[PDB]
């Protein structure tokens, strides 16, 4: 069968657009409309003219295209679609943190459940959260959920940084190590480093460059060889976007279960059956509305 032949003409005739984020399946990043990282995604879900959103990504990607289009059909092709880091994250541990620092504002990973969102002062994605947080007016912060980002916020903007959880991160980028830096230094000697600020700080540290997989594709211009600590799809987008340079996976283990729930098949399930209808809560979306637009008017 010819999915992407049925998946563009049921795209176009349900006024359709496809989002998708850098980590998703080579096969889905031909047939989307977009690509980016979860701040571009945020930014291109405001400037939508179509009538149904199809998010190629996972449950709180799509969840804030929701909040940002309430009149709009947002569809998830899969609800398994999730994120490990941003369900580790729970309202109990925000209000436990306002209740021990009653002026600090709570900012939030944009990786995080909706719920979360509601008691969000400000939402951060890793390409703006050092920008946010330095612009915020108290000097100690309520950050979560992930404890490796909170650690390169905590360095870039020398604000006094509370995490939320203690144990809040991304399996994906953890499994990078000191080993796997030493090691790609000695396969690729020539080449440089660039190291998403989820990973451990010991692995930030030998980073040539730190940024969001938005930030690696600007940045990617400044060398011919790089070799890419982040999700393994992010190699198959900076080669296509630039087929004279080099890219090197740091890890070929480093893939994210979760993006790869989406596949080329629920995708045109998803168009064929108008599924899996993305809904947040009123009163949740409202909420949630102000902490991610004020993040969209500070960065
Ligand atoms: O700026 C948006 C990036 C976003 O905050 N997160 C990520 C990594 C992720 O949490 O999946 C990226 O680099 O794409
Ligand atoms: S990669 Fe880590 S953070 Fe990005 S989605 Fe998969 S789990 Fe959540
Ligand atoms: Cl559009």
Redesign the pocket.
Known sequence: MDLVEEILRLKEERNAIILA???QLPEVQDIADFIG????LARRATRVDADVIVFAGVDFMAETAKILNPDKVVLIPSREAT?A?ANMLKVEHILEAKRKYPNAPVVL???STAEAKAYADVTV????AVEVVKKLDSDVVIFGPDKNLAHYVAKMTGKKIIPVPSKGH?YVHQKFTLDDVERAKKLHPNAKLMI?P?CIPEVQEKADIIA???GMIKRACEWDEWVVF?EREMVYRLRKLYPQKKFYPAREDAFCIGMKAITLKNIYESLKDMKYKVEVPEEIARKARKAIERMLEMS
């Open positions: 984020h850098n980590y990282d979860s701040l571009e994120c880091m990973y944009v990786n994605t890793s390409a703006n991304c998403h989820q969001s997989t938005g982040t």
